[PDB]
C-alpha cells in the first residue's frame, strides 16, 4: 500500500513514456557497487542506475511493463501508485523509456532509473511525488572504422570492419522503405557478404551490390517495426584493392547514406585507412648512378635474420603470406633499375621483430647475387613523397675480370 506518484516532464506533449520494473537489475548492480564493503557507498546508487540504464534495449523487451503514459498538460506524464516495495520487502527500482514521440521531434529522452524510496531535500522523508525532468540527446546517423589503433593502415587483402548506425524514424510505419547505400571511396571494396544488422534476421531485407564497390540495403518499413525511434547496427567487412598507384599513402573512407523512402539523410563518412608501399634502384654498389637491369626480387618477411614468410599477389588481388615458397612476389628491373611493391601495411603494424625484406633470386648479368635479402622500411608517406628515380638504392658488387 506504500506507493509513490513519479511524474515526468519533457521539453512537449504527444510523447510516450513506458515503465519497467528492473528491481532484480538493480539490486544485482547494487551488490556489485558495493563488494565486500562495511556499509555501501554514498555513490552506489548512482553507479548501479547507470549500469542498468546502460542495459535499456535489450531490458525493454524482457522487463515487465508496470506503466505506460503519454505526456499531456504542459509535457507532464504521471506515472501513480508505483509500489515502494515487492511482496518480500525489497526496494523496486524503475526503468523509464521514451517509446513513441511525433513525427517531427528530433530529440529522444535518455532512459534513466529509478530505485525506491527517494528523499527530500533533508534526506530523511521519504517523497510520495517525485518529479523528473529526463536529459535529451541528438541521435544521428553515424559510420565509424573499428579498429583498436592510433594508425589505420592495411595490406592489400586484409579484413577492414566497419559499423553503420541510422535513426529509424518514429513514424517508419507510415512508410514504404528504408534504403542504407554504402559508397566507398576508391581503392576500397565492401564486402557485401559479410553484412549483419543487429535484431533484423536476413530474411527481413536484401543487398545489392552496386558499380562502386558498395552496396545498397533494401528494408521495407514494416520490417523495422520494433526500431521506431531506435537507431539500426549494421556490420560489415571490406579491404582495399589498389588499381591506380596515386591512391597509395591516401586516406580512404567509407562512406554512407541512409534513406526514407525519397528524402535522405545527410552523407555520414568513417575515418580513413590508409595502405603503404616501398620504391627501389638497384645499383652498381661501386658506382651508384649505374642503374642495373635484369634483376628479380621476391617480397619476402624475416625475423631473426631469417627468412620466415613469402609474400604472394599484388596491390590489387591483395598479399598472402606463408611458408610456402612458390609463386611468390617478384619484381624485375629495367634499365633505369627501378621497381617497388605497394599496397603494404606499415612496419609498425608487423609482428613482433618482423621485417619486411626483398630477397634477389635472379642477378644482373655479371653482378653477384645477394647472399641475403635486404630488409625495408614502410611508414605513412614512405612511397608517395618518393620518385621512382630516388628509390631505395640496393648495391651490387661487379664480377671481376680472370687473369693467370
Known sequence: TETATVTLHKYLDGVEFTAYDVTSEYADAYKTATGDKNESPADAAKTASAAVAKKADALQKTATVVGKQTTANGGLASFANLPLRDANGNYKAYLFAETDAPANITQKAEPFVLAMPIYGADGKTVQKSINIYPKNVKQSDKKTLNDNRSHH???????????????????????????????????????????????????????????????????????????????????????????????????????????????????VKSEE????????????????????????????????????????????DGYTFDTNNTNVATKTTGENGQFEFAGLKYSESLEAGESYAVKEVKAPTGYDLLKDPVLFTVTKDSYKTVQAADGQKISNTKKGGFLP
Not at 571490406?238 to 547514406?257: F, M, R, V
Open 153 to 267: 593502415d592495411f595490406t592489400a587483402g586484409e579484413k577492414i570492419n566497419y559499423s553503420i548506425e541510422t535513426v529509424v524514424p518514429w513514424n517508419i510505419a507510415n512508410k514504404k522503405v528504408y534504403t542504407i547505400t554504402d559508397n566507398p571511396s576508391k581503392g576500397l571494396i565492401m564486402d557485401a557478404d559479410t553484412i549483419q544488422i543487429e535484431g533484423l534476421a536476413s530474411n527481413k531485407y536484401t543487398v545489392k551490390k552496386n558499380a562502386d564497390n558498395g552496396f545498397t540495403i533494401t528494408i521495407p518499413a514494416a520490417n523495422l517495426a520494433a526500431f521506431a525511434g531506435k537507431t539500426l547496427k549494421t556490420t560489415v567487412k571490406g579491404h582495399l584493392s589498389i588499381e591506380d598507384l596515386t591512391l597509395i599513402d591516401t586516406g580512404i573512407p567509407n562512406k554512407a547514406t541512409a534513406k526514407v523512402d525519397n528524402e535522405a539523410h545527410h552523407e
Open 273 to 316: 585507412v590508409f595502405t603503404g608501399g616501398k620504391k627501389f634502384v638497384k645499383v652498381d654498389g661501386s658506382n651508384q648512378s649505374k642503374t642495373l637491369a635484369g634483376a628479380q626480387f621476391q617480397l619476402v618477411i624475416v625475423k631473426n635474420g631469417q627468412v620466415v614468410k613469402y609474400a604472394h599477389g599484388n596491390e590489387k
